[PDB]
From Swiss-Prot:
Name of this chain's protein: Small ribosomal subunit protein uS11c
Source domain of life: Eukaryota
Part of the full-length chain shown: 29 to 138 of 138
Main subcellular location of this protein, as a coarse class: plastid
GO biological process: translation
Cited function: Component of the chloroplast ribosome (chloro-ribosome), a dedicated translation machinery responsible for the synthesis of chloroplast genome-encoded proteins, including proteins of the transcription and translation machinery and components of the photosynthetic apparatus.
Species of the source: Spinacia oleracea
Keyword Electron transport (UniProt): no
One GO term describing the cellular component: chloroplast
GO molecular function: rRNA binding; structural constituent of ribosome
RNA sequence: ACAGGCGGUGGAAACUACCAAGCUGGAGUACGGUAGGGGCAGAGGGAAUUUCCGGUGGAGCGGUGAAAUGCGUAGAGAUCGGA
């Protein structure tokens, strides 16, 4: 399984088995980016490549991607995962869905 | 003098009012149907978030017009499971 978390400030990529035990991970920050460059779609490509490249070597051709949240790199990360030597079954997005649960913050003025 | 005010007196009875009977168009009751987050009170339900418990794993996470404070190898964030 390949959990990916998209956002405007960073994109995280954690790999794990079906049982939920991580084997490796890497984000835009670990790759070398910092600040606003992390949220760019290009950083998601390079961040996804470094995390999955070690996994393709250790067998496990099967994979499932779990997208979580918005961002510019969520679509670019698919090109990184697709541009690889692995198949995949699910392309589902495990996003939260609050039914008017809590109070969000106030709107920004600037 | 007119106009106007007060009081008395004899007449007219539409209108306002009074008195005696009538009607139902306004209003209301009894019925028979009907929609709705009307209100009060008591039970039931799920996600989401937060904290704690552990497992996995190892360096960033998070934030900004840019940055830092801050959280983190005393194991964060992420990822399954549970209260
Ligand atoms: Mg008369």
């Amino acid at each position: 399984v390949i959990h990916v978390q998209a956002s405007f400030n960073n994109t995280i990529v954690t790999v794990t088995d079906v049982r939920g035990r991580v084997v490796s991970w890497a984000s835009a920050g670990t790759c070398g980016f910092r600040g606003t460059k992390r949220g760019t779609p290009f950083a998601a490509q390079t961040a996804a490549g470094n995390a999955i490249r070690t996994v393709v070597e250790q067998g496990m051709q099967r994979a499932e991607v779990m997208i979580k949240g918005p961002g510019l790199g969520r679509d670019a990360a698919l090109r990184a995962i697709r541009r690889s030597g692995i198949l995949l079954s699910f392309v589902r997005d495990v996003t939260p869905m609050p039914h008017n649960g809590c109070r969000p913050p106030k709107k920004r003025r600037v």
